[PDB]
């Protein structure tokens, strides 16, 4: 492929194991804060929101007192894996993502997706791009 479009497209938006269902959202950053490739549904993220996740990889923890924001919307923290994958929750939705060499791999969810669905759909892709070497 020679657009990371085509990843969020065919990796992070398709039917999920053809249930009919699909992430609400999704993106690739890299681990500057730079946009790859984002769904046109993915919110307006703001700068710092995006900072704070890249510390997050960096030191597992410090999201803890304020939540994960993105796009003004909060999200607790829920078990992740520290310096691969931080996971959050909002209602019956939430976030996960999963931290590559050079990347980081957004998925956003909504019911009646369930968390694991998420996780699945962007380890899979993260662990793509980390075969790859990146
Ligand atoms: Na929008």
């Known amino acids: 492929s020679g657009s990371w479009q085509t990843y969020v497209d065919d990796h992070l938006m398709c039917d999920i194991e053809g249930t009919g269902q699909h992430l609400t959202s999704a993106a690739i ?3 500057d804060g730079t946009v790859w490739a984002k769904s046109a549904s993915f919110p307006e993220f703001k700068p710092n929101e995006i900072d704070a996740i890249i510390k997050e990889f960096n030191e597992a923890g410090q999201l803890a007192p304020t939540g994960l924001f993105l796009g003004g919307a909060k999200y607790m923290v829920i078990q992740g894996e520290a310096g691969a994958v931080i996971r ?3 209602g ?3 976030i996960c993502i999963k931290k590559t060499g050079q990347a980081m791999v957004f998925g956003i969810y909504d019911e009646p997706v369930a968390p694991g669905q998420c ?3 962007v380890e899979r892709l993260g662990d ?3 075969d790859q070497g990146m």
């Open 29 to 31: 950053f890299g681990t």
């Open 88 to 90: 959050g929750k909002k």
């Open 92 to 94: 019956a939705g939430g």
């Open 119 to 121: 996780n699945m759909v």
């Open 128 to 130: 793509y791009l980390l």
